[PDB]
């Protein structure tokens, strides 16, 4: 993964979830949504600039690392920026 070793070599793998009692998706929502609204908005605006300045980089990272892909989606969901039905056009 030369792309990552060059640009994104410190990508987090994620937490370990015990999916015999808790589903990843539910954790995903409670994870982002337990955070004060300022966070999601701060991340997404900051990120928005970053991804506008680096569309190739940003998109290719979302291509390979799905936690960010859905992390962005769920934050869009929790604030009401976008709905699930607005994400399926992306899907």
């Amino acid at each position: 993964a030369n792309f990552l070793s060059q640009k994104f070599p410190e990508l987090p793998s994620g937490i370990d979830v015990n999916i015999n009692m808790t589903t990843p998706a539910m954790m995903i929502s409670s994870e982002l949504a337990k955070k004060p609204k300022e966070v999601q908005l701060k991340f997404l605006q900051k990120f928005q600039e970053w991804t506008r300045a680096h569309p190739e980089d940003a998109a290719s990272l979302l291509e390979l690392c799905p936690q960010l892909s859905f992390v962005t989606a769920e934050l869009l969901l929790t604030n009401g920026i976008c709905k699930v039905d607005d994400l399926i056009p992306l899907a």
């Binding site: 640009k7 994104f8 410190e10 990508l11 987090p12 793998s13 994620g14 937490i15 370990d16 979830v17 999916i19 990843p24 998706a25 954790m27 995903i28 994870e31 982002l32 908005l41 701060k42 991340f43 997404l44 605006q45 900051k46 990120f47 928005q48 970053w50 991804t51 506008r52 569309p55 940003a58 998109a59 290719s60 990272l61 979302l62 291509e63 690392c65 799905p66 936690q67 960010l68 892909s69 859905f70 992390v71 962005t72 989606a73 869009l76 604030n79 009401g80 920026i81 976008c82 994400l87 056009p89 992306l90 899907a91």
Partner: protein, 40 residues
């Protein structure tokens, strides 16, 4: 480079292997976020 906020966030959720359900298209999402989205 990625800002630290992003890094922490990527780590706080399930491992990327627990995400292989429906997923979203990175390329569409980025073009969507850049042009079509305005974060409140």
């Amino acid at each position: 480079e990625l800002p630290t906020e992003v890094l922490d966030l990527l780590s706080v959720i399930p491992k990327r292997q627990y995400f292989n359900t429906n997923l979203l298209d990175a390329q569409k999402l980025v073009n969507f976020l850049n042009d079509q989205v305005e974060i409140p």
